[PDB]
Every structure is written in C-alpha cells, then in structure tokens.
Amino acid sequence: EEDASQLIFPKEFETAETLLNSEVHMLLEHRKQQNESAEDEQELSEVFMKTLNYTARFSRFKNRETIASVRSLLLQKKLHKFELACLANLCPETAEESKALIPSLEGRFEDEELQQILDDIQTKRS
Amino acid sequence: MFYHISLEHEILLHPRYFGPNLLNTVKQKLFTEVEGTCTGKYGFVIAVTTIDNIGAGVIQPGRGFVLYPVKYKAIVFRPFKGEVVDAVVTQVNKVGLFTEIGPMSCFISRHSIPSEMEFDPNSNPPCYKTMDEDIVIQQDDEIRLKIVGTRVDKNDIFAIGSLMDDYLGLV
Amino acid sequence: GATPAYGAWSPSVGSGMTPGAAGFSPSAASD
Amino acid sequence: NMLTKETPETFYIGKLIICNVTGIAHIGVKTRLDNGVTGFIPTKFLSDKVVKRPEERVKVGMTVHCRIMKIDIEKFSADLTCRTSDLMIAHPSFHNINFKQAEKMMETMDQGDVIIRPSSKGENHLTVTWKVSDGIYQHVDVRATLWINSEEFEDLDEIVARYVQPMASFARDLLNHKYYQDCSGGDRKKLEELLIKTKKEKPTFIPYFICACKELPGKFLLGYQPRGKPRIEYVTVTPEGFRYRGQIFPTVNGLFRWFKDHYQDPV
Amino acid sequence: KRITTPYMTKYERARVLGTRALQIAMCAPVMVELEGETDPLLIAMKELKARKIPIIIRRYLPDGSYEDWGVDELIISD
Numbered sequence: 001e002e003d004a005s006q007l008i009f010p011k012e013f014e015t016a017e018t019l020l021n022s023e024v025h026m027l028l029e030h031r032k033q034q035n036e037s038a039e040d041e042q043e044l045s046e047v048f049m050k051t052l053n054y055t056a057r058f059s060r061f062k063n064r065e066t067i068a069s070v071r072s073l074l075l076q077k078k079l080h081k082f083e084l085a086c087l088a089n090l091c092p093e094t095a096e097e098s099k100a101l102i103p104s105l106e107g108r109f110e111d112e113e114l115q116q117i118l119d120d121i122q123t124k125r126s
Numbered sequence: 127m128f129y130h131i132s133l134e135h136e137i138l139l140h141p142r143y144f145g146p147n148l149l150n151t152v153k154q155k156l157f158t159e160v161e162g163t164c165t166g167k168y169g170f171v172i173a174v175t176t177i178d179n180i181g182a183g184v185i186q187p188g189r190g191f192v193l194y195p196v197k198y199k200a201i202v203f204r205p206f207k208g209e210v211v212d213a214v215v216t217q218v219n220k221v222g223l224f225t226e227i228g229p230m231s232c233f234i235s236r237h238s239i240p241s242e243m244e245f246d247p248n249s250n251p252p253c254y255k256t257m258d259e260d261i262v263i264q265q266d267d268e269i270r271l272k273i274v275g276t277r278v279d280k281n282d283i284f285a286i287g288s289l290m291d292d293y294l295g296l297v
Numbered sequence: 298g299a300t301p302a303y304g305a306w307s308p309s310v311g312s313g314m315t316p317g318a319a320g321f322s323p324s325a326a327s328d
Numbered sequence: 329n330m331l332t333k334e335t336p337e338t339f340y341i342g343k344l345i346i347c348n349v350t351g352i353a354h355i356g357v358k359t360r361l362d363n364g365v366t367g368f369i370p371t372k373f374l375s376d377k378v379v380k381r382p383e384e385r386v387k388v389g390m391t392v393h394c395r396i397m398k399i400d401i402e403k404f405s406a407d408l409t410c411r412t413s414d415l416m417i418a419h420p421s422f423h424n425i426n427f428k429q430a431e432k433m434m435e436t437m438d439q440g441d442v443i444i445r446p447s448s449k450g451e452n453h454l455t456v457t458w459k460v461s462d463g464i465y466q467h468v469d470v471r472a473t474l475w476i477n478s479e480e481f482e483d484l485d486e487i488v489a490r491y492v493q494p495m496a497s498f499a500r501d502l503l504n505h506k507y508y509q510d511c512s513g514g515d516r517k518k519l520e521e522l523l524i525k526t527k528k529e530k531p532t533f534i535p536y537f538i539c540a541c542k543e544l545p546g547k548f549l550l551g552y553q554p555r556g557k558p559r560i561e562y563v564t565v566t567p568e569g570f571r572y573r574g575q576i577f578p579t580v581n582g583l584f585r586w587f588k589d590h591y592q593d594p595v
Numbered sequence: 596k597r598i599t600t601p602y603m604t605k606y607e608r609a610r611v612l613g614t615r616a617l618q619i620a621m622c623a624p625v626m627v628e629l630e631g632e633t634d635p636l637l638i639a640m641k642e643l644k645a646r647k648i649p650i651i652i653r654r655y656l657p658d659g660s661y662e663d664w665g666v667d668e669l670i671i672s673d
Contacts, residue, residue, distance in 0.1 A: 002276075005208035012167065013204065017130040021212075024128045024172075024201060031173055040478060047162040047229050051172055051203075054228040055128075057268060058212050085127060086210060090270070097293045101210050141617075144649070145624035146471050182663075185614055185650070190621040298449030299427060301628065304472035304546050308562040310573065313595040315555050321534070324588040327581050450624075 004082055005103045018081050021089040023067050025055035060091055061126045070124050074117070080104070091121050127205060132178060133168065134197040135160055139183070141190040152180055152194050160200070162229075164281045169204030170229050203228060205285055207273050213287075215267045218252035220245050225271060225287060232271065232287040239289050263295065270294050329402075334363030336399035344415045345396035347408035349386040357386045358404075367406025369394075374410055385410030418493060420444065420485075427467075430457070434465060439503070440496050442488050454481075458492045460499055462510060466545040468492070491567040499565050501580045502538055502548060513542035519551060520558045527553055552591055597662045599654050603669045607652055608643070611666060615639040615648050643671060 001008060009016075028051060035044055061067065070088055079087075083104065092098040095115040099105040105114065135156060143151045157174060164170040181195035205211070205227065213232070217224035222235040236245075243254030243263055253264035263269065271287035271294065278284070329335045339345055347367035349357030355377050357369035373394065374382015386392045386408075395415035398407025409415060419441040423430075427448055434443055439459050447453035447469060456468035468474055468491075480487055502508065511518035519539060526535050539549045550561045563583075564571035570583050577583045603611075616639035619625060625638060626647035632638065642648050646667040655661045 002206055003208040004206040009206070012131075013129070019128040019130055019201065021128065027175060027201065028173070031175070038479060039482060042158060045162050048173060050226075051228045054214075054226075057214060090210065090212065091297075092293070101291065101293060141621040141623035144618070182651075185618075187614070190618050190623070298447070298469075300448070300455070300467045300469060302469060302472050303466055303544060304468070304474075304564065306544065306547070308547065308564060308571070311559060311561070313557075313559060315557070316594045317554055319592060320532075321592045322588065325585060327579075327585050 007080055007082060007104055009082065018085045020067060020071075020085050021055050022059045022061055025052070025059055026064065026067075028052050028055065058089060060089065060121075061124060063126065066124060066126070070121060073120060077109075077117075079108075088121065091125055092118060093122070094118070127203065127209060127211075128172070129202050129204060130175075130199070131168070131202055132197060132199045133160070133171070133202075134195065136181075136193050136195040138186075138191045138193045141192075149180055152196060153177060156196055156198060160198070164278065164283055166278050168202050169278075170202065170283055172201045172203055172229070174198050174200035203230070205230065205273050205276060205283065207276050207285070210270060210272045210291075212268050212270050215263070215265050215269050218246075218254065218265050220247065220252075223254070225269065227271075227273075227285070230283045230285060232273070232285050234271065234287045234289055238274075238287070243289075261295070267296065269296070332364045332401060334361075334365050334401045336401060339363075339365070339396055339399040339401060341397050341399070343396050344393050345406065345408055346391045346393045347386070347406045348391035349388055352381050352388075355381055357382060357388070357410075359406075361401070361406055361408075362391075363401060365401030365406060366404035367408060368404055369406060369408055369410065373408060382410050418442065418496065420488060434459070435463070439500060442492050442496070444484060454484075456488065456492055458488075458496055460545050461503060461540055463513065464540055464542055464545045472546070495565060495567045498570065498580055502540075505538055507535065507537045509537055509539055511539060514539045514549060515542075516560075519549060519560070523551055523553045523558050527556075550587070554591070554595075597664065599656070599662055599664070601669050603652075603666070603671050605672065608672065611648060611650055611652070612636065612639045612643060615642065615650065646671070 002010070028048065032044060032048070032052065035041060061070075071084065074084060074088065083102070086102065087098065087105075090098075090101070092101065095105075095111050095118055098114060098118060099111075137152065137155055137159065139148075139152065139155070156177065160171060161173055162171065176199045178197040178199055181197075183192040183194045185192045211227055213225040213227045215223060216226050216231070220236070222233050223239070225232050225234070239254065242256045243261075244256065246253045246255055251264050253262055255262050271289070272291055273285045274288045275286045276283065277286070345361060345367075347357075347359065347361055347369060349359035349367070349369055351358060353368075355371050355374070357367075357374060359367050359369070361367040369382070369386055371377040371382075374385050376382060381388075386394075392408075392410065393415065394408030394410055396407070397409055397414070398405060400406065417440065419437065421437075421441070421443045423443070423445040425445050430443070430445055434457060437443075437459065439461075442456060442458040445455055445457060447455045449469060454470060456470065457465050458468070460466055466472060470476055470487075474491060476487065509522075511522070522537070534553060536550070536552050539551075541547050541549065546565055548563050548565065550563055552559060552561070566576065569576045569578055570580075572583055572587075575586070577586065613636075616635040619638050620635040625642065626649060627638070627642045627645045629638065629641075639648070643666075648666045651663045651665045652669075653661050653663050
C-alpha cells in the first residue's frame with residue numbers, strides 16, 4: 001500500500017520533517033567538522049562517508065541562505081510536505097518533465113503555474 | 127528519503143560509569159549505539175543531531191544498572207516505493223545495472239531497461255548505448271530512477287529501481 | 298586516593314560578639 | 329627455495345628477524361628461525377668467545393628478536409644481532425610517578441616552578457603540583473576540582489599559565505609580607521600562643537600576621553585579637569584573585585585595603 | 596508543594612543502603628573518604644551518615660502522583 005506516488009505515509013512518518021539533499025549535506029558537513037576535531041574521539045563510519053559524497057554529488061546550491069529561500073516560496077503554496085524535497089532536488093526543466101515524473105503533480109496545479117515555480121528553482125541553482 | 131525525527135532510546139549504564147562525567151557518558155553511549163543502523167519501522171538512521179533530554183535514571187532493583195530513557199533528534203533515511211531519486215551508476219553488467227542511493231544500493235535488470243540502451247561488453251567500459259551511439263550511459267553517471275519495491279535485509283535496506291519512465295537519464 | 302580535594306573545601310566563618318569601641322588603625326591607598 | 333621455501337631475497341638487512349636459538353655448537357647459538365632458516369648466531373651475536381655463551385643476549389630455548397644483518401637461510405646461518413641497539417623562574421617539569429617519591433624531588437626547586445605528574449586516584453586524570461611555601465604544595469586534582477574540557481590535554485602549556493602561574497604570583501606576595509611566619513608548618517596550637525604573647529608588650533597597638541596550612545594547602549590564616557580572645561579567619565587563593573568572605577579581589581593590594589576597614593566591627 | 600513526611604522511613608533506609616552498597620561493590624566511585632574499610636555495607640552506611648548517597652526517592656502517592664526527595668533532603672532516623 002505504501003506508495004508515495006499516491007501520497008500514503010505511515011503515522012510515524014506523516015508528522016516527520018522532510019529534508020533536502022543539499023540541506024542535509026550541510027548538517028553532515030557540520031558533524032564532520034565537529035568529529036574531525038575534538039580528539040580522543042571516535043572516527044566517522046563509512047556510512048557517514050557514503051552519505052557525504054552522496055549528497056555532495058547532488059548539491060544544487062552551497063549557500064546556507066539559498067536553502068530557506070527555495071522552501072519559503074514553496075510552502076507559500078498548497079503543496080504536500082512530501083513534494084517538498086523531490087521537487088527541490090531534481091530541478092526538472094519543463095513542467096511536463098515534473099508532471100510526468102511525479103504523478104501527483106498531474107491535475108494538481110496549472111501548467112504555467114507549475115513552470116514559473118520550476119524556473120525559480122533553475123534561477124536559484126548555483 | 128532524508129528526514130528529521132525525534133527518536134528515543136533507553137540505555138543501561140554500569141555503576142562504574144557513575145561519578146562526574148555521567149551524562150557525558152550517556153551521550154557517548156548514545157552516539158555509538160544508534161548511529162548508522164536501520165529498522166523496518168523508521169529505516170536507516172544516518173546520524174544523531176542533538177539529544178533532547180535525558181530522563182531520570184531508574185535504578186534497577188537487584189542489579190546495579192540504571193537505565194536512562196533518552197530522546198534524541200536524528201536524521202533518518204527511509205525510501206518509499208515510487209519515489210524518484212538520483213543515484214550514481216556503480217556497475218554495468220548484462221544481468222543488470224548497479225547503482226547506489228546513499229547508504230542503500232539498487233539494481234536494474236535489462237527487463238526494466240527498454241531495448242534502446244543495449245549492452246556494450248565489446249568496449250573496455252561496459253555501457254548501454256543506443257544504435258547510433260549518441261546517448262552513452264556508462265558507470266559513474268548520476269542516473270535517476272524510481273524505487274519500485276523496497277526490501278530490508280536484517281537491518282539492511284535493498285530497494286529495486288527501474289527505467290520505464292521517460293526522462294530517466296542524464297539531466 | 299591519599300590526596301583528596303583541597304580547594305573544593307568550604308571555609309566556615311567564625312561568629313563572635315565583641316562590643317568594642319573605635320580605636321583601631323586607619324586604612325591606606327591602593328596604588 | 330624448493331625444500332625450506334625461504335630464500336635470501338625475502339630476508340633483508342635492517343629488518344628484525346626473530347632468531348630462535350635452540351642449541352650452540354661451541355660458543356655460539358645455532359638454532360632455527362621462523363622460516364626454517366637454520367639461524368646460526370655467531371660469537372659477535374652473544375659477545376663472548378672464550379667465556380660462557382650469549383645467554384643474556386639470545387634466549388636459549390625461546391625466540392629472541394634481533395636486527396637481521398645476514399640473509400643466509402640457504403647457508404645455515406643467521407646474522408641476528410643479539411643487542412637491542414643493533415635492531416634500531418617558573419619552570420615546568422614532566423613525568424611519564426607516585427606521591428611519596430614525588431615529594432622528594434619537588435623540595436629542591438625554587439618558588440614558582442610547577443611540576444607535572446599523573447594522578448593516582450582515577451583514570452585520564454592529571455595533578456598539577458605547584459610550589460606554595462616551604463614544604464607546602466597544592467596537588468590540583470583536576471577532573472581543588474578544576475573542571476576543564478578535552479581539547480586542552482594535547483597542549484599542556486596553557487592550563488598552567490592560566491590557572492597556576494597567576495595563582496603562584498598571588499601566593500608569592502604573602503610570602504614577602506612584612507608580618508609572615510611559619511610556626512613549624514602553620515600549626516593551630518602554635519599560632520594561638522603567639523597572639524597572646526604579642527598583645528602584652530603593646531596593649532594599644534594590636535598586630536596582625538599571616539600564615540598558611542600544611543595539611544590544607546592553599547588556605548591562609550589571618551588571625552586577629554580584637555579583645556582577649558584569639559580569633560582565626562580563613563582565606564582562599566584563587567587563579568583569578570583571592571576568596572575572602574566571598575569577595576573576589578583582582579589585585580593583591582585590594583585585599584589588605586579592604587581588610588583595614590573591615591576588622592573594626594563588633595561582629 | 597511536597598506533602599509527604601520529611602523523614603526517611605525505615606523501609607527507604609533499608610532499600611537505599613542495600614542499593615548503594617550494591618553499586619559500591621560494582622565499583623562505583625564512593626562519595627566519602629574511606630578511613631580504611633572495604634565492606635560495601637559499611638561504606639554505604641558511612642555515606643548515609645554523611646548524607647552523600649546520590650539517590651533520590653520517588654514516593655508514589657495513591658492517586659498517581661509522585662514526589663522526588665533527594666536523600667540529603669530528608670532526615671535520617673537511625
């Protein structure tokens with residue numbers, strides 16, 4: 001039953017807080033900054049490493065202020081919380097690419113309404 | 127997907143760890159207990175960000191241990207089926223393609239591959255080009271996918287990707 | 298151990314009752 | 329290389345090859361090595377040719393590590409060196425010691441030199457012994473509980489120059505006081521008997537003195553006789569100043585300037 | 596607004612001493628100077644007289660509430 005395409009999420013995960021791929025990179029980097037210092041401390045696992053490079057390959061932006069911006073303009077609309085990260089990491093070019101990839105965007109908004117937001121993202125992409 | 131939830135844990139503490147750096151030791155024993163694990167309820171837990179509070183430690187009657195119900199705020203990574211993610215291409219084989227989504231890897235058979243991306247074992251790099259050799263999709267390419275089925279294997283998630291939807295390639 | 302905490306100690310002040318007059322030595326400067 | 333399976337190209341000069349001497353022909357130690365190479369230790373390996381063998385330099389029956397100086401596993405020899413040398417104003421002391429034996433080395437330095445020694449109570453602790461007076465030393469058992477971090481243990485130069493050097497500079501001023509004594513270590517029986525003998529020669533002018541404890545180092549004794557009853561007031565020396573009636577003085581002079589106008593109350 | 600008795604009942608003294616002596620025998624750092632003894636019940640009793648046992652007592656009340664009282668807060672009886 002669990003399909004995020006039809007937006008069905010468990011109760012433990014409905015109230016959860018989504019995160020962006022560029023967003024969590026700064027947290028992981030900060031934790032790496034903390035653990036790389038403070039000696040007589042354990043070194044970081046390889047799982048930490050395999051997620052560092054992972055979100056590093058998909059950093060659409062590296063500014064701290066750029067992150068809250070792209071979400072401020074999204075939460076102003078009437079989108080789901082689940083749509084918040086998948087539509088902020090992939091950064092599709094056309095709104096047809098977005099609606100074809102995400103089935104919940106089809107019929108959810110107007111095409112040009114969607115595309116203006118999409119262009120905002122490509123403008124924010126560094 | 128990377129999320130941010132407040133999780134809880136109750137840890138036991140041996141009486142030799144009482145004394146001045148007690149709560150610091152509770153922190154230590156939490157950092158190195160619930161980091162980098164995975165579950166069939168919350169999924170893969172990346173790292174813990176902060177520790178909300180330490181409960182009061184109830185001395186176990188009979189034994190010397192005292193357990194400490196601590197709630198923490200960590201970032202967890204739970205993929206759902208049908209989510210459309212980016213990943214990097216790890217291994218190109220006639221049996222299927224291997225990718226890696228952060229801490230969890232997936233695999234794509236030629237059944238999920240339409241016949242355009244043909245095999246290329248004659249080349250030194252195994253890639254999946256097409257008939258006129260313009261779209262070259264080889265190892266180490268940020269190739270999107272769609273998780274069409276999840277699987278956790280003894281505290282280890284293993285989903286399965288596909289290539290049937292359009293705009294699943296190079297950006 | 299044989300050498301416990303020395304400076305974490307609490308200096309108890311001693312109370313008294315001596316209703317004397319004022320015939321003592323003056324103060325000085327701080328430089 | 330076909331039977332023993334160990335040639336001279338694997339074993340090199342400079343690397344330590346463990347040579348197990350199991351017997352000796354005449355004066356040497358001819359045994360086997362780890363690779364079956366017949367390790368024949370010569371008389372230069374034991375350092376004795378007409379006297380007893382190198383039993384102190386090569387373990388007879390066991391394996392003895394030596395610096396490999398000959399690759400002769402096919403020649404039934406092993407140039408393995410039996411010697412260990414063949415295989416290869418406010419001072420701050422160090423210690424890589426106990427408390428009784430440390431008391432005998434810290435009596436010969438001057439006033440201000442601070443020693444560094446491991447603790448003896450617990451784990452990952454360090455005790456800062458700094459010189460106070462003649463025979464008085466404060467063993468700051470940090471965790472005198474001075475709570476610190478965990479980044480500072482790599483550099484042991486600032487925990488003294490921020491917490492003990494100002495403490496030693498504040499403690500040295502009371503030693504050079506105009507009315508200082510020792511009373512054989514700051515004994516409580518010897519200090520009450522001095523104020524009652526100094527008050528008789530001058531009943532009008534009342535004197536004051538200053539002394540420290542030997543069993544509780546870091547606390548000074550400020551005794552005063554406002555009337556025919558001796559009275560003792562304590563004071564603590566701090567890394568930032570002094571602790572007198574709970575008021576912290578930045579400089580050493582403000583304590584006396586605050587006391588000259590505070591001891592005239594009836595209490 | 597703690598309303599319970601301010602005295603350590605005799606059951607709390609038995610359980611606090613037995614528990615503190617178990618923690619001491621499992622090598623827990625003592626709060627008091629040992630004048631040179633080694634039994635953990637003698638040590639736990641010495642610590643109780645110095646009011647240095649690091650334990651608080653959660654006194655459930657019958658309605659469901661509870662009150663925590665440090666051990667150094669209430670008046671030891673024997």
